[PDB]
Amino acid sequence: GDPIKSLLVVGGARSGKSRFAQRMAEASGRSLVLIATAQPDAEMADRISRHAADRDARWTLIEAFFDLGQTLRREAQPERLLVVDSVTLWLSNLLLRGDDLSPPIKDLARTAARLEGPVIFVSNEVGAGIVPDNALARAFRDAQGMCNQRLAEACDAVTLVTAGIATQIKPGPEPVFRF
Amino acid sequence: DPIKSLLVVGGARSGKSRFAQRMAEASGRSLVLIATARWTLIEAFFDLGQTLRREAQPERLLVVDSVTLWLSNLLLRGDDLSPPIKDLARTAARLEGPVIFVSNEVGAGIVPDNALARAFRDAQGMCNQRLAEACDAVTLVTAGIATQIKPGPEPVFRF
Amino acid sequence: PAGGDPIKSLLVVGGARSGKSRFAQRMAEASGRSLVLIATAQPLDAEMADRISRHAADRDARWTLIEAFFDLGQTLRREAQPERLLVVDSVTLWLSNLLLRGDDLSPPIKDLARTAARLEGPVIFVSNEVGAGIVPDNALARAFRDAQGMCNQRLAEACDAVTLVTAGIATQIKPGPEPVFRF
Numbered sequence: 001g002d003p004i005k006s007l008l009v010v011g012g013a014r015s016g017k018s019r020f021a022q023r024m025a026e027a028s029g030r031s032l033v034l035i036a037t038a039q040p041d042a043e044m045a046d047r048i049s050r051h052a053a054d055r056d057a058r059w060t061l062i063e064a065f066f067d068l069g070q071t072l073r074r075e076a077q078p079e080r081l082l083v084v085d086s087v088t089l090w091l092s093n094l095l096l097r098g099d100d101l102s103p104p105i106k107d108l109a110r111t112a113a114r115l116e117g118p119v120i121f122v123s124n125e126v127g128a129g130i131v132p133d134n135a136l137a138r139a140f141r142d143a144q145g146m147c148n149q150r151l152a153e154a155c156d157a158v159t160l161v162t163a164g165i166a167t168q169i170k171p172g173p174e175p176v177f178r179f
Numbered sequence: 180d181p182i183k184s185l186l187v188v189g190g191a192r193s194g195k196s197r198f199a200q201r202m203a204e205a206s207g208r209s210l211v212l213i214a215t216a217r218w219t220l221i222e223a224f225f226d227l228g229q230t231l232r233r234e235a236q237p238e239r240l241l242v243v244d245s246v247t248l249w250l251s252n253l254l255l256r257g258d259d260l261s262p263p264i265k266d267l268a269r270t271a272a273r274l275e276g277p278v279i280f281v282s283n284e285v286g287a288g289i290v291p292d293n294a295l296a297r298a299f300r301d302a303q304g305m306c307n308q309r310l311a312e313a314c315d316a317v318t319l320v321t322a323g324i325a326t327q328i329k330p331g332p333e334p335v336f337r338f
Numbered sequence: 339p340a341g342g343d344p345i346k347s348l349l350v351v352g353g354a355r356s357g358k359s360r361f362a363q364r365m366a367e368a369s370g371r372s373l374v375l376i377a378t379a380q381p382l383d384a385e386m387a388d389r390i391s392r393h394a395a396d397r398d399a400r401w402t403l404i405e406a407f408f409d410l411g412q413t414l415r416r417e418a419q420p421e422r423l424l425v426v427d428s429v430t431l432w433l434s435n436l437l438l439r440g441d442d443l444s445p446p447i448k449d450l451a452r453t454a455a456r457l458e459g460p461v462i463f464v465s466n467e468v469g470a471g472i473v474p475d476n477a478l479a480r481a482f483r484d485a486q487g488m489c490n491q492r493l494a495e496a497c498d499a500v501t502l503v504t505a506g507i508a509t510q511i512k513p514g515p516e517p518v519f520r521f
């Protein structure tokens with residue numbers, strides 16, 4: 001079909017969303033850049049090594065632990081495809097630093113909608129479990145859900161990845177009901 | 180084809196509440212909100228079934244704010260949830276006018292450590308299955324995007 | 339191949355109390371095969387014993403039951419036959435049994451995924467999505483969540499068909515062409 005400038009990929013923990021984003025990037029023929037958001041315990045180091053092992057010499061790596069929107073604005077061009085490592089771990093970095101999450105979320109969705117070069121956003125679903133016991137985890141769950149809603153609105157295409165299988169949900173007609 | 184009932188399921192801050200609200204405001208009907216200036220507003224923490232029967236008319240379009248919190252209530256009071264959940268599903272088929280039920284998916288994380296969360300997780304799943312079966316239509320809302328799963332033929336696999 | 343042609347393998351994925359077991363049961367009862375439940379659930383407590391009771395009560399006398407708390411791949415390889423249909427109770431509870439015994443999870447996950455390629459008869463795998471909540475507090479819960487996600491990826495790749503069950507309603511996601519994008 002026609003080229004898009006923005007894809008959002010939403011999936012659970014260890015859903016295959018990362019691998020799916022990587023394959024969509026490697027099929028594009030663009031210059032490939034990974035926008036890394038993960039801060040390196042041994043659980044994170046293992047993830048970062050797994051991902052790095054499974055990326056060949058075509059890939060450039062730029063770190064953006066906090067300044068993700070600014071990084072996207074600076075690095076995006078038609079000749080390149082940027083893949084955001086994890087929207088989730090970027091949100092996690094802001095939360096734990098003390099940041100108010102609503103402005104950076106609003107700014108990222110604004111940036112997504114105005115992109116001049118293609119970007120794939122990889123993000124977690126974290127909303128389909130029980131209400132968390134502590135306040136900070138409830139605020140994170142809330143913000144990640146708000147963030148994915150804003151990004152889905154801004155982005156040209158949205159895919160859900162379940163057990164390694166991609167399903168497109170945008171573009172697509174919203175269901176209509178007559179009562 | 181017109182429908183009498185819609186179940187809307189999503190995660191926390193999925194966009195499902197605003198999806199259900201917006202489906203009413205597209206309907207041409209007399210929009211009403213149930214809680215557990217074109218809108219009325221009613222409370223039903225413990226009667227929901229009984230309530231919906233009373234407050235539904237052919238011209239009205241009710242919206243249940245959370246199935247999720249009504250469940251919580253019966254849970255807290257120590258109620259056997261199997262009969263009430265069965266009742267509300269029967270109710271959902273026989274309303275005097277249309278109804279949009281808004282409900283959470285809560286089963287797609289790990290098994291909770293405390294008994295009450297485990298019991299609520301279980302009831303919420305059974306409740307969504309029973310409302311999905313009774314309702315004419317069911318939509319999954321994911322990151323603010325609605326996908327229809329009913330009506331539509333369920334897949335069949337042969338062995 | 340047409341969609342109604344016999345398949346060898348189906349993965350059914352859903353959250354807790356999603357209808358996934360009933361979906362598997364319905365697909366099995368529509369076949370003409372000898373129906374065998376491969377039970378992985380241990381009656382560790384009253385809550386598990388209740389779930390076991392509900393599953394036993396749901397199944398008419400057409401069903402045979404074979405326990406495989408730990409040795410699931412070996413059980414499938416031994417018990418699969420062209421005239422039988424094997425239904426795996428819960429992949430999730432098999433993994434939970436391995437997690438608490440202390441086994442490394444990756445080798446038996448990969449063995450199960452390869453096994454699903456070359457059974458002598460058809461199989462349905464019922465498994466939980468456990469990835470769509472918040473990151474767990476403890477290390478064992480985090481290791482479990484990660485292994486279950488990896489397991490479902492491997493089973494979905496290996497199986498002829500994959501369905502997501504949500505509020506008791508099945509949606510097919512395999513077979514089906516993957517989305518394609520140009521950038």
Ligand SMILES: Nc1nc2c(ncn2[C@@H]2O[C@H](COP(=O)(O)OP(=O)(O)O)[C@@H](O)[C@H]2O)c(=O)[nH]1
Binds near residue numbers: 013015016
């Ligand atoms: N402790 C911890 N581990 C994480 C976190 N985020 C990701 N991980 C680990 O990385 C896994 C997800 O790996 P990844 O390849 O990113 O998954 P995919 O892209 O969904 O297939 C999880 O199951 C965890 O093991 C986090 O915030 N905390």
Ligand SMILES: Nc1nc2c(ncn2[C@@H]2O[C@H](COP(=O)(O)OP(=O)(O)O)[C@@H](O)[C@H]2O)c(=O)[nH]1
Binds near residue numbers: 290354359360389434
């Ligand atoms: N305590 C405990 N309960 C569980 C576990 N696994 C499943 N259950 C219970 O069994 C319910 C799932 O029933 P099941 O018939 O398997 O659901 P379906 O196949 O998803 O409809 C859950 O909501 C829990 O109440 C577990 O590991 N521990």
